[PDB]
Structure 1
């Protein structure tokens, strides 16, 4: 970590190590030399880590954040992309700097884009997932696709919302003229601008800033024969810009000092829109709209000709009136100054996506889902997409802050290592089972035993270790009970929300594949308790040398593994109440040598 958080160099050509390529986390990885703030980063071990820069861009828009997280009160399993983004957004705030992964988001996105002119985005975005790491015009093409899919799903949710259109909606009126006696208009609500192919130059020094480029994209006359004039008469809350220029324009844009205007005032006077720096040069006839830059995504062309995206973010501080600027690499997060955040002089920096937010609207605080009324009906309700020894929970069993539950999950392997670029990427969740941990009549009996549906191709079920047979096909199911993934995730998320305490064997690597982060006070992992330096003790072994159980033979079963993980934690509490915490534990060292940690 030789100055890995250094984001500034003595010259303009040497890229700082803060923008360098980060080593992949392969699970025994220290993140303290990469993030000193309470703002989380993203695991680059995904199919396409260029989107990670864009999710971090939207996480810091109060309107974009509070809505997507707000949709978590109601249960909207049909909108796969909006709710998985809400799980991801809520995960980043709860981690307070801890690492986060967007595997569920990219998996829901890859399955959504694989549902194949309404298809122009699918063949383009789906091709980048499989995969000069990133090409040109790809981040902007995903920025258009992400907002177009969220708003399309923003309607199909419960209690239909139009919040994203009141923030991103551009009333784009575009008219085409056949002849001088005929003119036809079309009205389309666009979520983002497109500063693409700007082959028009006027007197510039009146160089200049970005403001004329936004004015051109808001009202321009185009000539294309298969004349045309498109103009927007709306100044929405957040302005999502997608720069698509030429290298001759990008070379001449890094010379104009302070081109990326931090804050500006704009209003609609004529049929077009006017944008000037301060309110003094504004006419003042209409009502003024102050816009501040909320963040942007830049492309970094490394000295080794490596391409990767980073995210710049400004977040307001309600305590004292200032602005904390942040630079988001994959998992490298640094609190940088604004002067360094706006400087475009570096040739290895190319702005890709820029967002502008309303001044008074950016100061709005970020509201978590905990301040809302959440609907926990999925726990007590049986949701089966099919046609069972557990018993569903009753309202007398209302989980509160401190309820004990035993959880054990089973996964499958979709893809191999594919190294030599070295990144084991694919692993899919197949089954979880949560057990009642509270003592009483309904003790040790499960309440949800769901199999996660999966339509993707499976490489190996790992049946000897997962107990999963090829009955995971939705129609042709061996059908323990096949339930979707967005529903079974909500059961785990709500228990963590309420404050339930999870017990089990190896919960850290289970939640990683589940793609959720549960705090320490809610995790009781028997592997960390019955720990002897390295060489984590086997669950079949602890259930033999500490208990009289000959288990984990034939095919594994999460119901059996979670039940024995619950009594093992109960036997741990027995040995802890009396001062025998070491005698039984130090003796299992020596007894394991004579048996070589295996016995029939």
Structure 2
């Protein structure tokens, strides 16, 4: 469609790659939007600027390997850390396939609404989610919040870690003269740097001023001098200043430095362009640009964020650059990624990583020893017909399980401008392997959703108003983070999933399961258009028919199991193709009714 073009002939003409993309809304061909194995994010979210920032922290080896590395152990208390881990892990699994951050965003909204770090952190993030139109100096405001929320939660995981402080930690001592000849210092470990209205090129002078500056402003005119004597592994900058000075950045050739050298000699910090021109003491490190997030002012005068990314190749010692839109993913050259001459380009969040540490490969969770203990026990929140797991039933790379989920609606379409909200409510998984414990369920759990729902859909989902955890119908009610882990482990071990319309369930549980692990009875029993109903298909291929009233997931998952078993029968003997049309004639002439 001539959209992956990321360049043009005029500086004012924005390439089609940086344009607004249409909503996903339903099968959507994504093959003309990304030809690489690096996935994109579904833009059908409430707060849209967060998608660009998650992609930035994806391609840091230290940032990625830790958040994914926290998935071996069960940490449900830390919501934003594990939901980002699920998101980071699933995006690497997709290998180009579409991904959604809806589960990560539902955890960020619930954590923010719990305000009943300063409160100004959470209060600002709440207003932007409910109303995308990029505001002034808002994306970096979320950057400081995200890292600070990760640092706080990182110290609360099991076998508590400080790995994120050993990578983002900026030991900044803030000295202030309270009176004549009386110094007062504060030692605060900040996760990211901020750019102010610096006075009088290149980017290095702006970084040096942010690490050693002298200001005069207080509640009298008390001068304050804050400096940092630490060089962390990844250096996250929150660049924000005036437009009149932003226009001067456009004219400065090669303003964004790709690689640079710098260390501390005196109480200040100095950064040099080449390894020869630097001076001072013995040791000095090298920093390379790992990526940055820039805003695009459209020609229709609208705004959105993109993410530039550099990733190392261990085979060939070179750097492959990438530009990440919502789902528009392109491989670009380094000359085009560092170009700031375009007036619509405005860099907002720039990060630098250690040169020797950027070359570190990305390690998945598969390399660690994962703990699958949640599958064998219960984790009911409130104290108040199935059989749970035994250690003999060890799920293998080919274990059959029948899955069916049901969920309620939260919001409406809200057109004008896309349908937005539908959160998981109930999910039940069945044993698929033949034997004594065959066709019986092992996990039948509810979510703990407390948000104001709009419609329960009692006729289709078949749940009662009992999702308020302690109030109504405490029947194996459990959280949403815990049950996801149960589903995530089965996909991790390689269990094959059977059911009806399984692609739709995974879209709202927000987990991507590969093709060779899904056995969808809807696709197996598909003949062109007019997908068949599960209750109608059971009443014409088998004998069970409970009038299809107030659907239950334990039933829909059990009939979908034997419907699969009936498929292998009609497939072992050369029957299925003949019966595949036999049901059609009985359906076309009966209007698909019981």
Q: Which bin holds the TM-score, normalised by the shorter protein?
A: over 0.9
Residues matched between the structures, number: 589
Question: Structure 1 residues 590-599 or 380-389, which shifts more?
Answer: 380-389
1:433-467 deviations in Å (ceiling 9; x for gaps): 00000000000000000000111000010011111
1:207-257 deviations in Å (ceiling 9; x for gaps): x11000000000000101210000000000000000111000100110000
Q: 2:49 touches 2:132 (CA, 8 Å); kept in 1?
A: no
Offset at 1:339? 0.2
Rate the CA distance shift 1:240–1:10 in 2: closer, same or farther, 3 A.
Answer: same
Offset at 1:3? 1.1
1:368-405 deviations in Å (ceiling 9; x for gaps): 00000000000001110012911011010000000000
Rate the CA distance shift 1:158–1:218 in 2: closer, same or farther, 3 A.
Answer: same
2:352 match: secondary structure: strand
* 1:557 aligned residue: 552
Question: Structure 1 residues 129-138 or 226-235, which shifts more?
Answer: 129-138
Question: Structure 1 residues 379-388 or 443-452, which shifts more?
Answer: 379-388
* 2:193 aligned residue: 193
- 1:485 & 1:474 partners in 2: Cα distance? 12
- 2:587 & 2:198 partners in 1: Cα distance? 72
- 1:390 & 1:341 partners in 2: Cα distance? 56
Unpaired runs of 5+ residues, structure 2, are none
1:400 match: secondary structure: coil
Question: Structure 1 residues 377-386 or 475-484, which shifts more?
Answer: 475-484
Question: Structure 1 residues 542-551 or 64-73, which shifts more?
Answer: 542-551
- 1:286 & 1:23 partners in 2: Cα distance? 54
Q: 2:72 touches 2:370 (CA, 8 Å); kept in 1?
A: yes
Unpaired runs of 5+ residues, structure 1, are 200-207
Offset at 1:122? 1.0
- 1:286 & 1:339 partners in 2: Cα distance? 33
* 1:137 aligned residue: 137
Offset at 1:154? 0.2
Q: 1:268 touches 1:286 (CA, 8 Å); kept in 2?
A: no
Rate the CA distance shift 1:87–1:456 in 2: closer, same or farther, 3 A.
Answer: same
- 2:310 & 2:218 partners in 1: Cα distance? 43
1:225 aligns with 2:225: no
- 2:336 & 2:472 partners in 1: Cα distance? 56
Rate the CA distance shift 1:584–1:132 in 2: closer, same or farther, 3 A.
Answer: closer
Offset at 1:181? 1.8
Offset at 1:583? 1.1
- 1:193 & 1:284 partners in 2: Cα distance? 24
1:154-200 deviations in Å (ceiling 9; x for gaps): 0000001000000000000011102332111000000000102324x
Offset at 1:279? 0.8
Q: 1:267 touches 1:286 (CA, 8 Å); kept in 2?
A: no
Rate the CA distance shift 1:33–1:552 in 2: closer, same or farther, 3 A.
Answer: farther
Offset at 1:348? 0.2
Offset at 1:423? 1.0
Rate the CA distance shift 1:552–1:22 in 2: closer, same or farther, 3 A.
Answer: farther
Q: 2:258 touches 2:288 (CA, 8 Å); kept in 1?
A: yes
1:295-341 deviations in Å (ceiling 9; x for gaps): 00000000000100000000000001000000000000000000000
Offset at 1:132? 7.1
Offset at 1:581? 1.8
Offset at 1:577? 0.3
1:100-148 deviations in Å (ceiling 9; x for gaps): 0000000000000001172011110010000171101110000000000
Q: 2:59 touches 2:311 (CA, 8 Å); kept in 1?
A: yes
- 1:219 & 1:356 partners in 2: Cα distance? 18
Q: 2:39 touches 2:99 (CA, 8 Å); kept in 1?
A: yes
Rate the CA distance shift 1:189–1:495 in 2: closer, same or farther, 3 A.
Answer: same
1:252 match: secondary structure: helix
Q: 2:384 touches 2:474 (CA, 8 Å); kept in 1?
A: no
1:67 match: secondary structure: helix
- 2:472 & 2:75 partners in 1: Cα distance? 25
Q: 2:398 touches 2:496 (CA, 8 Å); kept in 1?
A: yes
Q: 1:53 touches 1:328 (CA, 8 Å); kept in 2?
A: yes
2:62 match: secondary structure: helix
Rate the CA distance shift 1:552–1:150 in 2: closer, same or farther, 3 A.
Answer: farther
Question: Structure 1 residues 174-183 or 208-217, which shifts more?
Answer: 174-183
- 1:86 & 1:551 partners in 2: Cα distance? 41
- 1:272 & 1:54 partners in 2: Cα distance? 30
* 1:23 aligned residue: 22
- 1:381 & 1:478 partners in 2: Cα distance? 21
Q: 2:112 touches 2:122 (CA, 8 Å); kept in 1?
A: yes
1:146 aligns with 2:146: yes
Q: TM-score, normalised by structure 2?
A: 0.98
- 2:332 & 2:316 partners in 1: Cα distance? 18
- 2:534 & 2:154 partners in 1: Cα distance? 45
1:334-372 deviations in Å (ceiling 9; x for gaps): 000000000000000000000000000000000000000
1:76-110 deviations in Å (ceiling 9; x for gaps): 00000000000000011000000000000000000
* 1:203 aligned residue: none
Q: 1:543 touches 1:551 (CA, 8 Å); kept in 2?
A: no
Q: 2:312 touches 2:319 (CA, 8 Å); kept in 1?
A: yes
Question: Structure 1 residues 544-553 or 360-369, which shifts more?
Answer: 544-553
Q: TM-score, normalised by structure 1?
A: 0.97
* 2:119 aligned residue: 119
2:484 match: secondary structure: helix
Q: 2:48 touches 2:132 (CA, 8 Å); kept in 1?
A: no
Offset at 1:283? 1.2
1:535-585 deviations in Å (ceiling 9; x for gaps): 110001110110001136221100000000000000000000001121111
Q: 1:407 touches 1:432 (CA, 8 Å); kept in 2?
A: yes
- 2:354 & 2:472 partners in 1: Cα distance? 51
Offset at 1:288? 1.1
Q: 2:234 touches 2:351 (CA, 8 Å); kept in 1?
A: yes
2:379 to 360, 383, 388: 383
